[PDB]
Design a binder for this molecule. Structure first.
Ligand SMILES: O=C(O)[C@@]1(O)C[C@@H](O)[C@@H](O)[C@@H]([C@H](O)CO)O1
Ligand SMILES: O=C(O)[C@]1(O)C[C@@H](O)[C@@H](O)[C@@H]([C@H](O)CO)O1
Lengths: 254, 238
């Protein structure tokens, strides 16, 4: 049950400059994720970053921070260094709440950490349903599909599953009514310190570089992943300035 | 090794498929069809025919009735060669049959590398990708894997570099008669209903599928001297 949260907060970002420090109602984005993790019930909350400026701000708001190499290509790779640096036991459960999920409800953090034992996987994540076609067709929205038991089939930026009879000869994209079969992946993962170590022992894959999805290294290497549907999202992932206005809107509506 | 080919149908491609199933080493070759005419034409070139119900939404479902009518043992390996695959040699057909035990799976299939970018966006070309060992991750009419950098507003399919990251699924499956009976025992899935891909029912039910990457070879064993004389014979009578 017990677990520790590590929040990867890379500074550089093509889409959103200074992303982690992006302002949201008076506080940088990372602070929201942080204060959220505090109420999750985690035993320790660590902001993993690669920028001195981000480190200062994170310290200014009382967050323990671990500096990491700017050479990492993903949060999972970054957390591999934190786990080693801070000698966190292999059996310790780590929940990676990516620094761009400022609205993730605290209750689901505990849920994902528990899903490792419940579903017998070395890695577990979450997802919310997609209701609008615009979001489904958005490459920034990562889609995921599982089998009857929740075990992931594939993660992709591509439109899956493909609705052949509705999409092939689609006359008007606005007249699109999705069927209840789409899931947007939340940028949150649960995995033991030891599994993270195994992750970086595996070699980078072409698959993860094509899609730009760190979790594909896991599927590529025959490792099972469980994803569970959460209810009441309300917002997921901020990669663009627009998603940023999406979060401000969902908050303005107190 | 020792498998029987069952062809769900519904010079003709029907015959060209029969002769490939024969040169594949199969012990028995059955032509499953729900049409009297087709069944009639299959008895023309000496093919075993098994009339099946029209109430089958997929070749795999049609094969279930066959396995029932012919009382084929559950452990008997059946190779479903959906239709014609001119660039697919018969030696590969046996390998897919042997892959069931090799990779320890109940369903085995194959795929070819995509060389034309237009295929990726052709909904009628089914794309597939596997893990490092060949176990399928997903099948889709949508392009997968998705190349973020290149597809970000691609205004010309001709600029797409394939990097050998893409595979086209070929409609040929290997699976024991017992597994086929299992297939039709599982309820139809939302997944297969949307994508219109029968194999998705297997994935959704937590089963693994192994796919082999095959090399496209020129039409091998398309006709025999005899078949060609007959063709010329028809033409000459004019
Ligand atoms: O927002 C992200 O940084 C990212 O896109 C990184 C990816 O590797 C992947 O983890 C993704 C999640 O699938 C959530 O979209 O988040
Ligand atoms: O639609 C197809 O392509 C079909 O003939 C039936 C599908 O269920 C599926 O088996 C498909 C194969 O994936 C080959 O494309 O063949």
């Amino acid at each position: 049950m017990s677990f520790t949260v590590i929040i990867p907060a890379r500074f550089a970002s093509s889409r959103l400059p200074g992303k982690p420090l992006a302002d949201i109602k008076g506080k940088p984005m990372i602070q929201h994720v942080f204060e959220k993790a505090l109420q999750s019930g985690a035993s320790r909350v660590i902001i993993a970053t690669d920028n001195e400026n981000v480190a200062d701000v994170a310290k200014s708001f009382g967050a323990e921070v671990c500096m990491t190499s700017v050479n990492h290509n993903s949060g999972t790779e970054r957390l591999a260094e934190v786990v080693e640096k801070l000698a966190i036991p292999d059996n310790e459960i780590i929940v990676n709440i990516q620094g761009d999920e400022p609205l993730i409800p605290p209750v689901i953090v505990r849920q994902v950490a528990d899903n490792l034992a419940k579903f017998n996987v070395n890695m577990a994540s979450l997802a919310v349903k997609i209701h609008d076609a615009e979001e489904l067709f958005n490459p920034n929205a990562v889609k995921v599909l599982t089998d009857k038991d929740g075990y992931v089939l594939y993660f992709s930026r591509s439109v899956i599953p493909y609705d052949r009879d509705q999409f092939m000869n689609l006359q008007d994209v606005q007249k699109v009514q999705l069927s209840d079969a789409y899931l947007r992946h939340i940028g949150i993962y649960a995995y033991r310190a030891g599994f993270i170590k195994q992750y970086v022992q595996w070699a980078p894959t072409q698959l993860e570089n094509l899609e730009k999805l760190e979790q594909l290294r896991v599927l590529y290497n025959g490792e099972r992943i469980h994803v569970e549907l959460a209810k009441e999202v309300p917002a997921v992932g901020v990669d663009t300035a627009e998603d940023l206005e999406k979060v401000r809107a969902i908050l303005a509506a107190n």
